[PDB]
């Protein structure tokens, strides 16, 4: 009977003896799973053909509402996606940081272990805007050589906004289109009118294909102020690929999405650390 029976209450204090869950699966975080879902849904509704001009971009300003000059402030304390159609984030991180930031990335890009992993490029261009009678055409003109480098109608699909209260900076993630120009004969055409918007981008870039990310340390002087801004573009080949084959190898799309966001972070966090 019972005095004989093996003490089976070897469980009410069994807890004192590391599977990453009671499942052993790693559930996609709340925010991550969106950016995925989102990014995804968005790609879909852009027609197939146009699909090759996917700029998936990520910037840093301060999210600023319709109803204030001051930076936005919900009652939340950890990064979350901020649904407010009125909300507007204008990219512009501080110089003193901008300065310090580039150095870190660059030093960090020539480390003994990250030899064949980072490719740094300086460019100094002129982006010009151009209009009909409405369509808006960007055009690259080099300054040292003066030579059309990228000729597009930049359109815009959807954006996300990432309130980052624990950080000095929020993030607009923009999935938008580079539609190359209709005409067979236009890069010449619009070199007709003195451009109705002109800017100067001394841009320093930082590829890394190991995650499919490329990083931009852009000093733009518009014609009175001059803004310094920071961007993390994702290699459209790979992005289009991991979409192209979702159903099949599903976790390609997941793993590349988070790397994108992990990269979003390291910067955003560092960019917050450097402060003081």
């Amino acid at each position: 009977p019972i005095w004989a029976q093996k003490w089976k209450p070897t469980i009410k204090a069994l807890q004192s003896i590391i599977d990453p869950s009671f499942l052993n699966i790693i559930p996609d975080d709340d925010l991550t799973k969106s950016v995925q879902d989102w990014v995804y849904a968005t790609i879909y509704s852009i027609a197939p053909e146009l699909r090759s001009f996917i700029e998936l971009e990520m910037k840093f300003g301060v999210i600023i509402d319709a109803k204030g000059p001051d930076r936005v402030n919900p009652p939340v304390s950890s990064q979350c996606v901020f649904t407010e159609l009125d909300a507007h984030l204008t990219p512009n991180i501080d110089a003193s940081l901008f300065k310090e930031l580039s150095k870190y990335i660059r030093g960090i890009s020539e480390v003994t272990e990250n030899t064949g992993k980072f490719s740094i490029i300086e460019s100094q261009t002129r982006d010009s805007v151009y209009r009909v009678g409405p369509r808006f055409l960007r055009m690259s003109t080099d300054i040292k050589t003066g030579r059309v480098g990228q000729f597009i109608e930049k359109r815009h699909v959807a954006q996300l906004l990432l309130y980052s209260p624990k950080d000095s900076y929020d993030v607009k993630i923009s999935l938008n289109l580079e539609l190359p120009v209709p005409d067979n004969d236009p890069p010449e055409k619009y070199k007709s009118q003195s451009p109705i918007s002109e800017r100067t981008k001394d841009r320093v870039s930082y590829i890394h294909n190991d995650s499919c990310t490329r990083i931009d340390i852009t000093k733009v002087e518009n014609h009175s102020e001059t803004t310094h801004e920071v961007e993390l573009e994702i290699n459209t080949p790979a992005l289009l690929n991991a979409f192209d084959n979702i159903t099949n190898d599903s976790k390609e799309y997941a793993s590349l999405i988070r790397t994108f966001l992990n990269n979003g972070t390291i910067i955003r966090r560092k960019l917050s650390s450097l402060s003081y």
Binding site: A4, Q5, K6, W7, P9, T10, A13, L14, I17
Partner: protein
């Protein structure tokens, strides 16, 4: 009792570990606990220690041991109160008036101030016998530094009267003669009611009845120096031979109605939970001893009296697998249990057991000491004539 103040961030703290370091003139308060620790009283300790020196005896207070740190801040200038607990953490209490008294004016104090003094207390909850209402309290038993001066290397004796005159006098009287220019007074403070060794008789009689919380007897040595971090051969903690104890899983060995054999084992390696995975498939242990083996080795046998039978008889739960706690009772050598620790998985690692085996023989009863009374009291006079 829940801590008097609170620590600040770790950074704000850090500064102070340092602030103590030179007042002791050793980095030790970086991470090592500056308060002297007491090493278990041995028999070998009578004719070596308790015969060729001098001793003091008060009870081990079971309160929260915290030493006292009082410093004015050339950060921006104020006496801060500080609490230095079991790991090197630093708490900060409200208003205290700690000074000196260089002149005379009973008044003199209201302006004076204590800087960089290190005293040793213990924090109790206190039951006022006439009225029953409780207060928090602080009872201090040693000091190792006075107003920037390092009172470590001093003979206990002095260190104490130095804590008497310089630290208590101001406090107490400032509260007799100005009972209102201090409401900022978070708790209370008194000095530990000391007593010389040969009064174990006069000590022991208290312990059970005192208005606080207390397990044991404490020996502190008169003409011996103090300590910063770590333990010391000369400070002596006494425990009830009883108090010492461990959690014995008991597995039953028996080949049907009255008492059978109850053997008590010690888990080793990692095979307990291992076994638990193959323990639910049970009929009874008979065949399990093949897999039970790599964790359990019985060096014991309890004892169940005929009354002590009629209490485990009506109430039960499955036994062959349980956990028990018990001390080798001295007037037998036999070890009856007083509690079962369901509250834990198993027993204890054998090493961790043998260390407790160690202390039980070295346990020297109250009656093993109330015999030494007249004998330290005979030698200790002899010293006064032989020196």
């Amino acid at each position: 009792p829940e801590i008097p103040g609170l620590i600040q961030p770790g950074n704000v703290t850090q500064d102070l570990k340092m602030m103590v370091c030179k007042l002791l003139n050793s980095p030790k308060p970086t991470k090592t606990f500056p308060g002297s620790q007491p090493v278990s009283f041995q028999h070998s300790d009578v004719e070596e220690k308790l015969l060729a020196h001098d001793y003091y005896v008060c009870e081990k207070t079971d309160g929260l041991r915290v030493l006292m740190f009082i410093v004015i801040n050339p950060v921006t200038g104020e006496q801060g109160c500080f609490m230095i607990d079991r790991e090197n953490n630093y708490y900060l209490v409200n208003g205290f008036r700690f000074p000196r008294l260089p002149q005379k004016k009973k008044e003199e104090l209201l302006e004076t101030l204590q800087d960089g003094t290190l005293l040793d207390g213990e924090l109790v909850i206190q039951t006022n016998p006439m009225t029953k209402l409780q207060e928090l309290r602080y009872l201090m038993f040693d000091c190792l530094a006075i107003n920037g001066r390092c009172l470590t290397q001093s003979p206990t004796s002095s260190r104490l009267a130095h804590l008497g005159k310089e630290f208590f006098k101001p406090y107490f009287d400032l509260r007799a003669a100005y009972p209102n220019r201090c409401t900022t007074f978070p708790f209370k403070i008194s000095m530990k009611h000391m007593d010389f060794s040969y009064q174990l008789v006069k000590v022991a009689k208290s312990l059970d009845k005192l208005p606080h919380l207390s397990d044991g007897l404490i020996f502190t040595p008169v003409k011996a120096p103090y300590t910063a971090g770590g333990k010391d051969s000369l400070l002596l903690k006494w425990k009830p031979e009883q108090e010492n104890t461990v959690d014995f899983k008991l597995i039953l060995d028996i080949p049907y109605d009255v008492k059978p054999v109850f053997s008590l084992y010690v888990w080793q390696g990692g095979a307990d939970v291992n076994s638990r995975l193959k323990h639910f498939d049970q009929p009874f242990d008979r065949k399990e001893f093949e897999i039970l083996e790599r964790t359990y080795r019985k060096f014991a046998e309890l004892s169940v009296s005929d009354e002590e039978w009629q209490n485990l008889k009506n109430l039960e739960q499955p036994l062959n697998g349980r956990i028990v706690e018990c001390a080798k009772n001295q007037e037998t050598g036999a070890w009856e249990m007083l509690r079962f620790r369901d509250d834990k998985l198993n027993g204890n690692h054998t090493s961790v057991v043998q260390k407790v085996l160690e202390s039980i023989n070295d346990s020297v009863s109250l009656e093993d000491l109330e015999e030494i009374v007249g004998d330290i009291k005979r030698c200790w006079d002899e010293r006064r004539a032989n020196m």
